[PDB]
Symmetry: D2
Subunit: 238 residues, 4 copies
C-alpha cells in the first residue's frame, strides 16, 4: 500500500491519524520534533524522522529518503500546528510569528514537497488540518483564527488549481479535541477558561474521531473529493 506522510505525529490528532493509517496497512513517514515519542508508538512499517516543519530543507529531505524505501507519497497530512491564545493588545508578538510559521508556512512546505510529483502522475491527496476556527471567530483566538482561515483559503485555492491533474486537496476542520494543543498557550487564565468551557460542554472529541474522518475522506476513490469535513462535539455551544 502507498506511503503516507504525517506531520506532528508525536501526540494528539497526528498520533491518532498515524494509528488508523497504519492499521489500514499504509507504510508511514512520521515527522515531529519529539522523535523519540514517535518511536515509542511502535507502529509497523513506519519511518520516524526528527523534523521541524518550518525547516523546509530537512523536511523535504526526510521525505525524499522515505520515498526511497516505500515509493511516492500518495498523501501528506499537514497536521503539525500550535495554538497560542491571547489578546492582540498584550500578546507577545513572537507568538504570532511562531504560529504562522508552523500552522501556515510549515503546511505550505508540506504541500510543495509533494505537489509537483502528484500532479505529474495524476494522483495524490493533500489533507490539511484546519479548524472550525478557520470558519468562525472565538474569544482569544485572533492570531490562531488568522492562521486557520489562511489554511482554509490556501487549501481551496490549491484544490481548484490541481483539480485537472486529478490531485485531491482536503480540509479537515475539527473543534474541541482532547490533545496537547491548549497546553502551549501562555496565559494560565485563558487555559483555565478554556478548560472549563470544554468541561461544561460535557467534554469533547477524541483524537480518533478526527482520525476516522480523515481516513474516510482518503479512502474514497481518487475521483471523489471530500473537500471539507467539519466536526465538533454535539454539545459544543458558545
Amino acid at each position: 500500500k502507498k506511503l503516507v506522510v504525517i506531520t506532528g505525529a508525536s501526540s494528539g490528532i497526528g498520533e491518532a491519524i498515524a494509528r488508523r493509517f497504519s492499521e489500514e496497512g499504509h507504510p508511514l513517514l512520521l515527522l515531529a520534533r519529539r522523535v523519540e515519542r514517535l518511536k515509542a508508538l511502535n507502529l509497523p512499517n513506519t519511518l520516524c524522522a526528527q523534523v521541524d516543519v518550518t525547516d523546509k530543507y530537512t523536511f523535504d529531505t526526510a521525505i525524499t529518503r522515505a520515498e526511497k524505501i516505500y515509493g511516492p507519497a500518495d498523501a501528506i497530512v499537514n497536521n503539525a500546528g500550535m495554538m497560542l491564545l491571547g489578546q492582540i493588545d498584550t500578546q507577545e508578538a513572537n507568538e504570532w510569528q511562531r504560529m504562522f510559521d508552523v500552522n501556515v508556512l510549515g503546511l505550505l512546505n508540506g504541500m510543495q514537497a509533494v505537489l509537483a510529483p502528484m500532479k505529474a502522475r495524476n494522483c495524490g491527496t493533500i489533507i490539511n488540518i484546519s479548524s472550525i476556527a478557520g470558519k468562525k471567530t472565538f474569544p482569544d483566538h485572533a492570531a490562531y483564527c488568522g492562521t486557520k482561515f489562511a489554511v482554509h483559503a490556501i487549501s481551496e485555492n490549491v484544490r481548484e488549481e490541481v483539480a485537472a491533474s486529478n490531485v485531491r486537496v482536503m480540509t479537515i476542520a475539527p473543534s474541541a479535541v482532547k490533545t496537547e494543543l491548549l497546553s502551549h498557550t501562555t496565559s494560565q487564565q485563558i487555559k483555565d477558561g478554556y478548560d472549563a468551557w470544554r468541561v461544561d460542554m460535557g467534554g469533547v472529541l477524541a483524537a480518533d474521531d478526527v482520525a476516522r474522518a480523515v481516513l474516510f475522506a482518503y479512502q474514497q476513490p481518487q475521483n471523489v473529493c471530500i473537500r471539507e469535513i467539519a466536526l465538533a462535539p454535539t454539545k459544543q455551544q458558545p
Copy 2:
C-alpha cells in the same frame, strides 16, 4: 435499528441514501410524489408514502403513522429539492416561489416534524442536503443558490440551538452528482450516500457538522 425518514427518495441522491440505510438494517419511511418508484425500490422494512414536503399536514401524518410501526424517527434526511435555472431578469417568478417552497419550506417542515421529540429524548439526527451552491454562487443559479444558502444558514442556526439537547444537525453539500436534478467529474449518488451514512454512524456525541464533496475533476 431505529427508524430513518428520507425525503426525495424516488431517484438520485435520496434513492442511494435509502439503499445504504436499508442495507445497514434501518427501517425506512420514504417520502416522494412518485410513490410507485418508491414501491419499485422494493427495499425490506420500508414504508412508502406519497407526500409533497410542502404539504405539512400529510408530511406530519406520514411520520406519525410510521413511528407507530417502527417507533420514533432517529434521523430525517431532508433531500427533496428541485433546481429551476434562469436569469433573474427573465425567469418565471413562480419558479422562485416553487423552489423556495420545496427546497426551504419543505425542509423546515421536516425539521419541525422531529425536532421537539428528539430534544425530549436527547437523541436524534437531522441531515440536510445543501449543495456546494449553498457555499458559492454560479451562473444561471441565482434563485437556486438562494435556496441552498438558506438551507446552510438554517442548518447552522438550528444546530447551535439544539446542541444542548444532544441533537445533531448535519449539512451535506454535494456538487455535480449524476441524478435527475438537471432533467470523470461526475459523482455517483452513492458517493453522497456513503458520506451521509458515515456521518450518521458516528457516536451520538460526535457531530459531523458539514461534508462538502465533489468530483476531483472539472
Copy 3:
C-alpha cells in the same frame, strides 16, 4: 431633475430614512408599502406614493410602470421591504416562515426583475438589496430570518456577477440592530423582551439614518465603481 429611485418598505424604519436622504439629494421617488397613508404623511417633494404589497408582482410592476411614465426609467431600486419573525424551529408557526420568505426573498426578486432587463439594455442602474449581518452570521431565534437573509446575500452576489458586463450595479447593505418597527412583528413576547434587553445592554443601537447615509454613499459613487457590500452595526454590538 435627477433620476427616479424606487423604494419599497418606505412607510417606516430604514426605508423611510432612505427616502428622506434620496429626496434631499433631489431624487424624484416612488415609494411602495401597504400603509400608503403613512407614505403620504412623509410629505416629500417629487414623490409618488402607491399602496403596493411587494409579494403581489403584477401590482408591484404596474406601480413602477406608472411612475416611469412621469419621471423616466428607474435608475435604482432599494429592495428594503422585509419582516423579521423570530422563533425556535421546533415550535414556530410554519406560516411565519412562508410570510417571511415571501416578502424578504420573493418580494425582493420581484423588485429586481421589475428593473433588470431595462437597466441591462441601457447599461445603467443600481440594485440595492437590504440584507443583514444575519445574512452573514447566525443568531439565537433567527433561524428562518437568517435563511431569508443568506438567500438575499447569495442572490445579490449571483446577479451582480451576471449583470456586471452590462454595467449594472448590485449592492448589498447588511445592517445590524437598527431602531425601527421590525422587532415588534415577532410573535413571542419573551423573544421581544430578550431582544430589547440586548439592545439596551449594548448602549443602544443604530439610527435608521445611519443605514440611509451608507446606501446613499454607495449609490452616489460613479457608475463604474461598485460597492458590493457595506456591513454596519453599533460599535458596542456583541453576542
Copy 4:
C-alpha cells in the same frame, strides 16, 4: 483634528488615503520604506518616517514620536502589503514567508501599537486593508489569498473583543485597483480612499464593519 497613522503610504491606495485625510485636516504619520516618496507628497502637517512594518521596534517608536507632536493616534490604516503570485508546487517559499510577515504580522504590529491606549480612551478606529481576495480565491493567488483571509479573520476577532471599549475595527476589501501592487474595469486608488474616509467619519458609535468594492465591470 486627531492624528491618523497610515502604513504603505508611498504609492497606490495608501497615498490616496493620505491625500483624502490630509485634505480633511488630519495631521498624519506616513510610514513606508521609500521615505523620499513620502516627503515628495509634500502634504501639510505630515510626518514621514522610514519604517518597515515588520520592524516592530521602529514601528512603535515612530508612532510614539508622532503622538508627542500631534497627540494620540485616533486611527491607524494598516495598508502596507505586497502580492507575490505563484503556484504552490513551484513558488519560492521565501515569498510566502515575506508576504505573511508584511501582510499579516505587520498589520498585527500596527494593531498592537494603538489597541491598549485606544481601549483606555474608549475611542479609536483601526482600519485594515484586506481584499476581495480575503473573501474569495483566485488562480495563482494561493499564498496572497491566505494572507488576506488571515486579515479578515483577525479583524473580525479583534472587532468582537474591543467592541465593549468603544473601539472600531473596519475591513476595507477592494479589488482591481490601479496601483503598484502588480509590478475598464479598474478602480482608482481614490475610490478606495473615499470609502475609507466615509467609514472613519461616521459617529464613533457607528462601526462600518466592512466595505467591499470593485469596478462594476470585469
